[PDB]
Amino acid sequence: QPGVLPENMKRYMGRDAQRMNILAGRIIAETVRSTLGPKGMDKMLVDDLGDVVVTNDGVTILREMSVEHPAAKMLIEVAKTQEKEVGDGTTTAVVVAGELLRKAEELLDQNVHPTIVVKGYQAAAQKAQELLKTIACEVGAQDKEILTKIAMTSITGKGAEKAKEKLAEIIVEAVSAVVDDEGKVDKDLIKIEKKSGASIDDTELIKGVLVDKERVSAQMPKKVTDAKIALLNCAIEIKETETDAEIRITDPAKLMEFIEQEEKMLKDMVAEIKASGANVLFCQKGIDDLAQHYLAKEGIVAARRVKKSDMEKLAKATGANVIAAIAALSAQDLGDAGLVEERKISGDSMIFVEECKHPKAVTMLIRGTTEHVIEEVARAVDDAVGVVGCTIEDGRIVSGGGSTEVELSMKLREYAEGISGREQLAVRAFADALEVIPRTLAENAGLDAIEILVKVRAAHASNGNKCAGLNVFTGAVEDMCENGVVEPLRVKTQAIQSAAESTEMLLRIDDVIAAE
Amino acid sequence: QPGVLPENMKRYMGRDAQRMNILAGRIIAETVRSTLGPKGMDKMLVDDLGDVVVTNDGVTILREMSVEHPAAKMLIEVAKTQEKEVGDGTTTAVVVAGELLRKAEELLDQNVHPTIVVKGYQAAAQKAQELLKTIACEVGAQDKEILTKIAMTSITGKGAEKAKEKLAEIIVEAVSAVVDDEGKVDKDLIKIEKKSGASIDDTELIKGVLVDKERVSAQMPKKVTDAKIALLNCAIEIKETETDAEIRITDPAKLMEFIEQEEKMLKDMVAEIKASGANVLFCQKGIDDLAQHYLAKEGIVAARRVKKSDMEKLAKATGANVIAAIAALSAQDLGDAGLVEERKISGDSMIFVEECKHPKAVTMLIRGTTEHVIEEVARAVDDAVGVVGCTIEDGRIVSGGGSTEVELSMKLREYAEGISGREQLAVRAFADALEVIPRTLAENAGLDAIEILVKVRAAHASNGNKCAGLNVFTGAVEDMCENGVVEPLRVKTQAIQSAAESTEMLLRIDDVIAAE
Amino acid sequence: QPGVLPENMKRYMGRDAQRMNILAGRIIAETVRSTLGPKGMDKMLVDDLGDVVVTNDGVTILREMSVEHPAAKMLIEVAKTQEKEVGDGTTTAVVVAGELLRKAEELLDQNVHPTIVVKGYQAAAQKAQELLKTIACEVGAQDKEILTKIAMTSITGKGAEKAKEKLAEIIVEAVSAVVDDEGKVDKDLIKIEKKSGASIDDTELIKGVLVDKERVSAQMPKKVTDAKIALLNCAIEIKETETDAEIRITDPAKLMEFIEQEEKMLKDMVAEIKASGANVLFCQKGIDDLAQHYLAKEGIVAARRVKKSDMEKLAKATGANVIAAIAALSAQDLGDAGLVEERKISGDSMIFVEECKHPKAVTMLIRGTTEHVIEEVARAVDDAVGVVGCTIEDGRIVSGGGSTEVELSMKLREYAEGISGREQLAVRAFADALEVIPRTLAENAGLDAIEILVKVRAAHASNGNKCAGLNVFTGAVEDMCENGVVEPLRVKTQAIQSAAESTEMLLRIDDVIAAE
Amino acid sequence: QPGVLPENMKRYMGRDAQRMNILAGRIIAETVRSTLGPKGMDKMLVD
Numbered sequence A, B, C: 001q002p003g004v005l006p007e008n009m010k011r012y013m014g015r016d017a018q019r020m021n022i023l024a025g026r027i028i029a030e031t032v033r034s035t036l037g038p039k040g041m042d043k044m045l046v047d048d049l050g051d052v053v054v055t056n057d058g059v060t061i062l063r064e065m066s067v068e069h070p071a072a073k074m075l076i077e078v079a080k081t082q083e084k085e086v087g088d089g090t091t092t093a094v095v096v097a098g099e100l101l102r103k104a105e106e107l108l109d110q111n112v113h114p115t116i117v118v119k120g121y122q123a124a125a126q127k128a129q130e131l132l133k134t135i136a137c138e139v140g141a142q143d144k145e146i147l148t149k150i151a152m153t154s155i156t157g158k159g160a161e162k163a164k165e166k167l168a169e170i171i172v173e174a175v176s177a178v179v180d181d182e183g184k185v186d187k188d189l190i191k192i193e194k195k196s197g198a199s200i201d202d203t204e205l206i207k208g209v210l211v212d213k214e215r216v217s218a219q220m221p222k223k224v225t226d227a228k229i230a231l232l233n234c235a236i237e238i239k240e241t242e243t244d245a246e247i248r249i250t251d252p253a254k255l256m257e258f259i260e261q262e263e264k265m266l267k268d269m270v271a272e273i274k275a276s277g278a279n280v281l282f283c284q285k286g287i288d289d290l291a292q293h294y295l296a297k298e299g300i301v302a303a304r305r306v307k308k309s310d311m312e313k314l315a316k317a318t319g320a321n322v323i324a325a326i327a328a329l330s331a332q333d334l335g336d337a338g339l340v341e342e343r344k345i346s347g348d349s350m351i352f353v354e355e356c357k358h359p360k361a362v363t364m365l366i367r368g369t370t371e372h373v374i375e376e377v378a379r380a381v382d383d384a385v386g387v388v389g390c391t392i393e394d395g396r397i398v399s400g401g402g403s404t405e406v407e408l409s410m411k412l413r414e415y416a417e418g419i420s421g422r423e424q425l426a427v428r429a430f431a432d433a434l435e436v437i438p439r440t441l442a443e444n445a446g447l448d449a450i451e452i453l454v455k456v457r458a459a460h461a462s463n464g465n466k467c468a469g470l471n472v473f474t475g476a477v478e479d480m481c482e483n484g485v486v487e488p489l490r491v492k493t494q495a496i497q498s499a500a501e502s503t504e505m506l507l508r509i510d511d512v513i514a515a516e
Numbered sequence D: 001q002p003g004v005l006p007e008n009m010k011r012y013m014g015r016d017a018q019r020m021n022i023l024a025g026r027i028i029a030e031t032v033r034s035t036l037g038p039k040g041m042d043k044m045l046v047d
């Protein structure tokens, strides 16, 4: 007689399920562990098409490997959410999750039951969030100096040689520029443009936007100072009714009369544009060739078929209103830019709209000698934008270099004393797990992690220094705050909560049923 | 139990990743190395269609072979950016990059950590940019004597037999002609035409453009001197309204009335063109057969369906504006050319527009006995256009023959002296890598590189001659600057920065993960 | 082009090598773990021929599986040596080894160096051997009461339903009978015979041997009491010279003369045999049909073509000399037995030689209702023979139920206190490893291992009872010695030494290179 | 593992490159040589 469950399926039960998930978990974490910290190393990933990524970026590495294993996929989500919510610490969150799994294994191997480790882990994680709040330092949303340390620290995570002050300062300026009325930071308002050049150091902030267009007619000016900018959502073409209409001509002289009426409509449209005071125009749709001439005659710069996202960012940066009826355009809808110029950048003709006074969107123009060099600089800039953004929004930071993890572990071990029975083992395991961060930072730096940890713990003990950690450079336990190695509270709260919730989910599993 | 990482994957870790990337790098550099300098040799590349490229051009070689290795691709980017930013030195940039990887291996082998190597490379490179600025010689953007030396030097890189004075002077004229208002050179403004002929020496500069078109009517003049040129992007055909319109005829008499209105409309367009004073007309689109007759009656030479990019180059060279409505055509929209002539070249009839007064676009008409001979001449012209452009824009040149690399190398060793720790080893390594240029120049010349190096070094020592290099023709060490062997500063700055940045990126890699 | 190491080869390095070895070991151990102790369960193994094995026997399970994994094979050697040296505790030895590897992982995952783990493991192993000597109790080789407990405990390891006093006593009698004149036990001297019957309880000890033979002629007695046994390894056939000899007959009268001669010497061999006083005969070679008759006439029981093996057991059993020259047969070569009988057993005709007075070999005749039921009873008999034999040879025993492991583990932690530095971690890990035994006993008994262990340790703490263990049959912590749960010291010394040596070997591996 | 330059490629270097080019040229020339001048002979080519 036939089998109930499909004969085309692999199944793993009890200890086998647990080992499968735990192992898949640990292995995923191990792949990114060697990237961690300023002394970490990079991966080169090559896809089936032969395209290559080289990067220190945790979540990028994990996405680009084509990981199939179901449990591994559950940990990759930890990295994706870290990137979305914070923009930095993707490796950290994943490595913590893998270590929570490793630490749980030791407990299951001693007959501690899964629901008990889940329970302890949940209590530990909650305690950790409370401890994090007390540990965190308040900072002002407009403390340029601290935000710059936040940016430098982030970039350094991808290597000391990336952390140029000028770059950190540029990033802080970019993010501060787009903070909205509610004090919120929308990362998308910072346009990232990537162009080969003489050097990574040519990277610059443009207060404005880069539009991949040329002016529609060579007769128009190619450089305009103090431009007055019109933004049109409608085509500068002959308008037609929605209701089907046809012209009937029975008198040979009407040909010219109609042709001359359509020409006049275009001349009128151009007239209205001129009247607003606009000397630069971006149209989201088509501009009739004939109108192209009239604009040129008037000395008005125009680009046509501008991307909707371009129009939207122009508006944000220049302060113009995208107008849908040429008739309705007025002086009040115009934006301002100190400079509008068409010029070539690494061989490509583009229109720069720059030197805007209070742009709500700006552009990081990232330069470097090669495409692949630029990509990684762009990834670093992104990490920095994320954490500067977090610090502006939250006004809360912690010390880095694994100082905070050490402080947490110590405190959690104190907490665990007060826990009765078996759950205590789980809480203690969760505490021990956090130390994978300082431990890995040390090993990637070529240091002895055990002795390093002994020293860092000692500096935290007996009401010591919550900011003490190992400076991977000097090799000494130092005050990370004094050294300016700092990171948003959010990096830690998100990473730890994600690691906890995802491992709790995985540790509840006693049966894996895989089809096909 | 299932695999965590995809099983379809090849992986190389630690020493193997480093070896892979270093070796692939080195091998890519070694392929173009024998092309380096005036005594370098050429490659013949045959693709899968049997098409043939023969060239001394580094980036061309590297593009044309179909390299798939991931680390080699990173190094090819170096050649591509060199071509884009400078136009010359593509081989130099790749060879330095290869040598940087080679010197890094020696340090990795005697147990220096990668981040220290990158730290050292970055410091040396930064210092080298600073030194390059003081080594450079100031030069005037209108000093044609120096620009001609720049161009001669460039062409000689591809073989002295290519370096003719007439050719180099022509190139200087071409580039001088298109310098814009900001003092920038867009090398796309110099159109390259390639046409077989009696000799390479028949290559000529046309102050104007070639149009692959014939006049639309044989009744039109084949030749106009002191041409007045109309540029129309609108068809010279009966204009249709945008709104759908049909003629209705009820009276037989009206049949002719409309037909003859359409002819009058045509005559009018032609009269207006004539009225501007135009005797030559390029139209981007169609011209009614009847209009073609009228034009020919009026003595006006016309070509139809002209490529938009042709229209554009025409406007740049003659001064005309491209007009959208024949109604607006005035005398001020007209371009000038000393000669417009339809004639045969290499069996093809084309329209020459020559002897323009202040052309903003011009045309190098490259001749030679065969197609493949011409191709390489055009490549050499491109190198020279590139470096003449840089010189005009930058006003900074250095001496060639590897003299500048020797000077740099010597100064970096001094700098290295004051560096503390392992980092010093990397700085010295970078210094030494630069000498791959003078060493390879001497190799390809059949000279003893080691002895040559001793000599050139001695000539730079004791505050000697920063311009001393080995002249591959003399066999002697001489002042290269006095010999007129010079190249733009930008050649060296772009090549060293790109080599530095790409190799630093490659050296960070400890893990290669290649799918499929 | 081309590769140094073979292209057809898998390789695992550093952490991957350690992981695959550690995992393979752990999984091998987990396979037999559930069999451990009196509450352990059994495996049914089926081979590729569809033959089945049902057993609780650790080493049998590991041999019958077709393990190919290289590290796993290393651990199976542990079970084989345990079987060879001791005959019991094969599961115990593998489970300790598996746990040593698990414990080692956690050390490796803190970055303790393999050699330090190895050094710690060796130090703990040597200390354990010293502690075992003092922990052990002395017993006399003639203490049947203790030997019976050793036997009962052993059989109980395979389930309480197997552990019958009568059977244990038989086994003690069997081993006692074969102890040699130096106090050594050769388990080979206890012939195992397996025959289906009415009940497992019908198992019996035969003071003598079973011969799978029938007497050569039905005319011979079927039964003889107080038999005088001759043992010949020469054929009772006509003797032929070693030099090629041929009879030549020329006189018809001589035909019968040579025939009559042959039978007369046959008749004389038989008279030589009778003369010795033998009435029972076992011949290794053939017995001429005619001599068969003669033996029959003289009333002598004989069997022919007896295999060397039985001849040798017969000699040991009855004290006869296997003789090679019929002429040399004297009455002092004859063995004795109370009863020689040809008898059917389970439908099989066999010669029982029993009730010998001081047999140097004896026969365990194992009975049971089915072949597979019998096979496992024989395996349990083999365990018991093994440990009774060890106890007789060593005169040292320890208490069972995991009591000795707990005592050992407690003393080793004390020892670890005085170890400086990192090695201390390893010594502690080794100590903790030994508790896998009491832990697994409890697990399989369905008890809570964590609390059980807390209790047993407390019973061992500060001058406690070294014999304190959990009794799986009562659920309480009791004095295992006073309950009679005891096992030879050698079980523990071999198990721990094997586990330590094999895992130290595996832990030194950092590179797996596998062909094909 | 793996190769930098494509695995599907022939390559001829130094004297081998010069030889194959020189030979190919010479053979091409020898093909039409016998046609040269008023006493030259003709080819029949079939596609």
Ligand SMILES: Nc1ncnc2c1ncn2[C@@H]1O[C@H](COP(=O)(O)OP(=O)(O)NP(=O)(O)O)[C@@H](O)[C@H]1O
Pocket (backbone or CB within 6 Å): A035, A036, A037, A038, A040, A056, A057, A058, A059, A087, A088, A089, A090, A091, A092, A093, A153, A154, A156, A157, A158, A383, A399, A400, A401, A402, A441, A470, A471, A472, A473, A485, A487
């Ligand atoms: N100067 C320093 N000394 C010690 N630790 C540092 C220093 N600078 C940064 N770090 C730490 O390095 C860690 C970040 O490294 P990084 O490789 O970027 O991990 P990540 O942010 O978790 N992953 P990713 O999303 O790829 O950037 C943080 O723990 C930092 O605190």
Ligand SMILES: Nc1ncnc2c1ncn2[C@@H]1O[C@H](COP(=O)(O)OP(=O)(O)NP(=O)(O)O)[C@@H](O)[C@H]1O
Pocket (backbone or CB within 6 Å): B035, B036, B037, B038, B040, B056, B057, B058, B059, B087, B088, B089, B090, B091, B092, B093, B153, B156, B157, B158, B383, B399, B400, B401, B402, B441, B470, B471, B472, B473, B485, B487
């Ligand atoms: N007369 C000379 N004597 C010695 N060296 C020279 C002389 N003329 C040019 N050179 C050098 O030869 C090098 C250029 O040769 P070349 O083969 O073109 O290399 P490249 O410019 O780096 N590659 P490519 O992009 O293909 O042109 C430069 O280093 C020049 O300084």
Ligand SMILES: Nc1ncnc2c1ncn2[C@@H]1O[C@H](COP(=O)(O)OP(=O)(O)NP(=O)(O)O)[C@@H](O)[C@H]1O
Pocket (backbone or CB within 6 Å): C035, C036, C037, C038, C040, C056, C057, C058, C059, C087, C088, C089, C090, C091, C092, C093, C153, C156, C157, C158, C383, C399, C400, C401, C402, C441, C470, C471, C472, C473, C485, C487
């Ligand atoms: N009454 C008992 N209470 C607690 N433990 C017991 C008792 N009787 C026996 N044991 C233990 O059970 C263990 C032996 O069980 P067993 O399953 O035979 O393992 P093994 O000897 O290592 N493997 P094998 O070679 O297959 O017999 C020993 O530790 C005994 O001390």
Ligand SMILES: [Mg+2]
Pocket (backbone or CB within 6 Å): A088, A089, A090, A154, A157, A158, A383
């Ligand atoms: Mg980071």
Ligand SMILES: [Mg+2]
Pocket (backbone or CB within 6 Å): A057, A083, A087, A088, A090, A379, A382, A383
């Ligand atoms: Mg990132």
Ligand SMILES: [Mg+2]
Pocket (backbone or CB within 6 Å): B088, B089, B154, B157, B158, B383
């Ligand atoms: Mg060159």
Ligand SMILES: [Mg+2]
Pocket (backbone or CB within 6 Å): B057, B087, B088, B379, B380, B382, B383
């Ligand atoms: Mg070139």
Ligand SMILES: [Mg+2]
Pocket (backbone or CB within 6 Å): C088, C089, C090, C154, C157, C158, C383
């Ligand atoms: Mg046993």
Ligand SMILES: [Mg+2]
Pocket (backbone or CB within 6 Å): C057, C087, C088, C379, C380, C382, C383
């Ligand atoms: Mg056994």
